[PDB]
Design a protein around this ligand. Structure first.
Ligand SMILES: *[C@@H]1O[C@H](CO)[C@@H](O)[C@H](O)[C@H]1NC(C)=O
Ligand SMILES: *[C@@H]1O[C@H](CO)[C@@H](O)[C@H](O)[C@H]1NC(C)=O
Ligand SMILES: *[C@@H]1O[C@H](CO)[C@@H](O)[C@H](O)[C@H]1NC(C)=O
Lengths: 224, 224, 221
């Protein structure tokens, strides 16, 4: 029996365009009347639970509570009082969380690197790395789209934020995309979109194809 | 009684990151008791109508009722009703506005044209046109960014959307950025950003400089 | 009421050139005069422990049981037991620990982008390690045979490969100045992994690596 308070990441709120606070109560006994109400410091939130998780392998139940809350309330700093009520707990427990404040804002520097020539020579799989560095407060959402069409989330993996060596305040993040050689050889202008607080547009785009390496001012070829 | 309910346009919701809805009364007594109330389907109370407009010299009544509302509920299509009653007319006037439904969403196609050679020859100024076409609905926000920071609102002018001739539902929009010729010679990489509903991130980016638009002038062939 | 020990990882093995044992006791309340001993699956003697701490208020006995053991004992798979005969429980408790598919890692070095170099405040060289199993790699950076300081370069934790769940990838960067890049430097990235037959691989990139080194085409105003 434990109660968790989960602040939604900017990765979560940007994906669905909604700040969805979520409270997990884990390892509760499988009893009846599983109800999760909602309050705040004012007391006007209303929503119930949806699709409570089944019994975990350690032989106990669990419940999840999620609600829709506006973006401006999330930016205001109000402590949202997520309350969970159950019969096993003699007293219902409520959780109050809010955004951290006072953190500096540093604009991300999204630089896109083409796959290495040695990797291209092997002709099995080519990897394109999106470098997102020099951004705070180190909460980013990086996704890949092809010709304006988003790709499957399984195709790409985004690394967790890590501290920058030179800059202590700024933290970087990484994401790689695996592509076939024939797709890269033809060139579909793969682009990287990065979402962050510090960006004035809050979204930035950088693209690369096979013809980026050529300076496009001269066309020199070697034929035997 | 005449009340003008101005819906929050996409430019308004995107510039301030907070949707602002205003219903403004028009052409009544210069100053008397008035009650403005935003009403949903549930009839719940709303934020107070701050900054009521002062009486105009031409004896035309005007009251600006602004409030902060849920961003997601506005896009959900549920209708917002401004209830205005006045001492002059006992019957209240109900004005209801919402985001229109039954409208197709078409992804904007952003084409960014370099300045003409004839204009660059006179060297008095350079105009860069940001062409956005095939976007629905009519609302759109266009602003200009130079090397990461936005331009002044006076510097750039965005034309009103007009119906596209080929596609009746789709529309097109224009925005010019007149700059001095010597700035274009430096190739400082002007960037055009646009905001619209249909884009996957709701915003997309295009860039132009002196290097872009230059073909391969030199096919230097080294063949043995 | 359990015992936990830190397994020797190939990075830690390669740093000290030997397998070292670290048994940080967890989930056991700190009492006076506790008994902790190192034994194998069969239980012969060990060397004396070193650098143990006092009682820990956080209910986790944060004193390390240090012992240096041969490499063949670790890679043979026979278990190691951190036997902790605690005061509260007369029955001794031990934790069996050992190594748990091997794929040769492929190391590819990506030169810094021109956008990074044009701005000139810094240059980042990325070391992409892919297709290694298990997740035990130590990415280190070499410059003309001189090992760079650990603070310059940082390596992310290995993540499962999207193409193959068995495969893992690790990615590391080196933060240098633009002058250090446009001036001739080797900047070798060396990667050590168990699955490598040589146990060590490295790649080198230069400013002229991108150039074909057949035609030096230049633009002059
Ligand atoms: C540029 O050079 C490549 C090298 O083979 C060649 O395939 C391509 O056709 C050239 N571009 C043009 C426009 O001819
Ligand atoms: C450039 O030269 C190459 C020589 O191999 C030729 O194949 C190509 O068609 C040329 N491109 C143009 C645009 O003339
Ligand atoms: C051509 O070679 C010279 C060697 O002195 C070098 O400095 C120069 O950078 C080379 N050209 C290019 C385009 O790299």
């Amino acid at each position: 029996i434990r109660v968790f308070a989960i602040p939604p990441s900017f990765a979560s709120i940007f994906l669905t365009k909604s700040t969805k606070l979520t409270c997990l109560v884990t390892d509760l006994t499988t009893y009846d009347s599983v109800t999760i109400s909602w309050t705040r410091q004012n007391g006007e939130a209303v929503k119930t639970h949806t699709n409570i998780s089944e019994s975990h392998p350690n032989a106990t139940f669990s419940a999840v509570g999620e609600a829709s809350i506006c973006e401006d309330d999330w930016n205001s700093g109000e402590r949202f009082t997520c309350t969970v009520t159950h019969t096993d707990l003699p007293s219902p427990l409520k959780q109050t969380i809010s955004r951290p404040k006072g953190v500096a804002l540093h604009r991300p520097d999204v630089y896109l690197l083409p796959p290495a020539r040695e990797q291209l020579n092997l002709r099995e799989s080519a990897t394109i790395t999106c470098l997102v560095t020099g951004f705070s407060p180190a909460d980013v959402f990086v996704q890949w789209m092809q010709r304006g069409q988003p790709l499957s989330p399984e195709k790409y993996v985004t690394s967790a934020p890590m501290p920058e060596p030179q800059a202590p305040g700024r933290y970087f993040a990484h994401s790689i995309l695996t592509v076939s050689e024939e797709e890269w050889n033809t060139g579909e202008t793969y682009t990287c979109v990065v979402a962050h607080e510090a960006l004035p547009n809050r979204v930035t785009e950088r693209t690369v194809d096979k013809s980026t390496g050529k300076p496009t001012l001269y066309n020199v070829s070697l034929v035997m």
